[PDB]
Amino acid sequence: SSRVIVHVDLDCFYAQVEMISNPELKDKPLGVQQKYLVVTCNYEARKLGVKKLMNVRDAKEKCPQLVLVNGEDLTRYREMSYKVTELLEEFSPVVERLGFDENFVDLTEMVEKRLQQLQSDELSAVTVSGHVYNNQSINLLDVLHIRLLVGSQIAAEMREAMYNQLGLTGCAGVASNKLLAKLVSGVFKPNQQTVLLPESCQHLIHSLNHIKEIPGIGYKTAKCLEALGINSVRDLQTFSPKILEKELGISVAQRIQKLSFGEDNSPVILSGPPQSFSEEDSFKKCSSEVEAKNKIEELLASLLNRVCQDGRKPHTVRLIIRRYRESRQCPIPSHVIQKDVMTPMVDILMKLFRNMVNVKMPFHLTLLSVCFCNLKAL
Template sequence: PARSTGRRVIVHLDLDCFYAQVEMIRNPELRDKPLGVQQKNIVVTCNYEARKCGVKKLMSVRDAKEKVPQLTLVNGEDLTPYRETSYKVTELLGEFCPLVERLGFDENFVDVTEIVEKRLNQLQQSGCSRVCVSGHVYNNQAINLQDTTHVRLVIGSQIAEELREAIYARLGLTGCAGVASNKLLSKLVSGTFKPNQQTVLLPESCQDLIRGLEHIQKVPGIGYKTAKRLETLGVRNVCDLQAFPSAVLEKELGVSNAQRIQKLSYGEDDSPVTPSGPPQSFSDEDSFKKCSSEVEVKEKIEELLHNLLDRIDKDGRQPHTVRLTIRQFSSTNKWFNRESRQCPIPPHLIQKFGKESSNIISPLVDILMKLFRKMIDVDLPFHLTLLSVCFSNLKDLPSSKKGSIGFYL
């Protein structure tokens, strides 16, 4: 069947400097100026004008301003416009094809196998063998039109171009695309030519692409902790991982994880494109240099709740669980000292979501402060650098007749 992994055609779409593009659409005067999007004291992304001048993603604001004094900075701490635009992109892709999976705000996988099969059949019936690739071919590899795998991927490149054109025509956004036989390879190849370009990967060039990754952590699916463990075993790049004895790897990482990772190192990935549907949870967080009093914690939680309740109102479903996450300051461990507690939302409050949102802020703050006190002894000094609130376990209203379009508005 077309679904069998050898015949799949997967497109990975990655929007160019997404936050910066959204800001340039909101304010067209920013278009031809070097522009950075700032969160706290970091430039989280910047447009290509700024990149030409030497500004890089995740640079400190100070360094960026030093490099480019005329850099325009826009505050990007309110994610609402990015989130809304992001769902519009996913919704638009869903009009072409039901199998669309979101990855963050600016990336989507689309399984176009079924559309490719239909077009391939039409081609064969019309007796036409001429089919033209859209965009680049990785490694400039020659296309063999006698090879149906090649023809399938070439048709996939045409569909990728149509998707990119539709996103530009309807939403004014540009992006890159990668076309390959699985999610891993399509994601890896999509950034070969940037911005606003696309690349197709033929199977014969797969090893070149994957072996060209300078570090094991560049392989999607191998996270920071796994990469660190592999490094202690002397595995730094893909070639090391391919050559590493399976038995030793299985002993270190467990059988299923070891096999999955070794398959990834050969460019093998049979994970399906899983439609994301509506968001599974709503969360918002705030990071800061220091928060060390209950009063401050309460204020910050209230601020987060206002934004979250707005988003939940628009969505139309009711959350049944709430979670609070904190990060305590640590001079040694910047990333991993987060702690969370969650609890069910009392039924009398659930009923009020979407109807009397302003009346539930106070009881929700009380619930979240109880969770907070389970993690922090407030009689002792504390130093927080992050607070995050998450509502999950979302369910439709009992009488709800909302269509799927509600997810994206």
């Protein structure tokens, strides 16, 4: 059962949202700042030299006409994120989320229908929407191709409906699994879509340069492979299965090797509603017992907001700390579920804290987070 998956990726998301909010900013170049960095910006300002993830001063010097904006309150982005996800669900119910600006959709069933509904005669021109990866020749006689071309049209449709109705632009990659879909989706940016035919699969993995470029292989797994002298995607393709299992575990080994061939059988998971809420906060110095108290209050303060609105309730709370991450958690008592409600929580959160960190001694940390998970019904 060959699948058709689509990966959707919004162009410079925060930027887009900001612009869609303050139209005056269409004309102007724009950057979104978190702490003293620039986390993303519209294209009008990537041309003036502004690289994503660059300090806000180099930014200003390199580009003086730059209109900055604060993107530390993730609230407008997160609402837009779900407006997008809901739009896409209205196409097919099975939509997986990846951060705020990515979505996976399984179009296998949807492509099925549209095909059957095709009178033989009209089996052309059929056509393709957007780019075909690596300019590959289409073979209308190959069902696999045909189902991917239909996947391209549904994607073009989704992208139209995102623009109309939400005012957002973005790219789409349509492939036979999530891996290839995500990889081929950025081959043409911004605001364009590419489809990957099967016979160009190998061209696409090898186009990659560092092995960490593949989704799934990350910082910790890369370094492991590096120290094994695995740097190219072909290195990994050709390496000893056995030695890899031995050095990575039989679970991780099998999967990432398949990855390096472009093989990915992981299904698209239906995300549904968020299963957690959390406010992170890292900082220069924190070294008493209070000031964690102040922090935990603020964090709690902001989180509470979102919980009041979500609907369902958290039956578990936890405390996270990256020291000099660790966590402790415990169920949230029956009474307190009455969305005042602060002091009891912070008493628990502190109880948590205390058992984890010795207050009768110095610590200093850099990171405090509070998380609400385990929400019913579930």
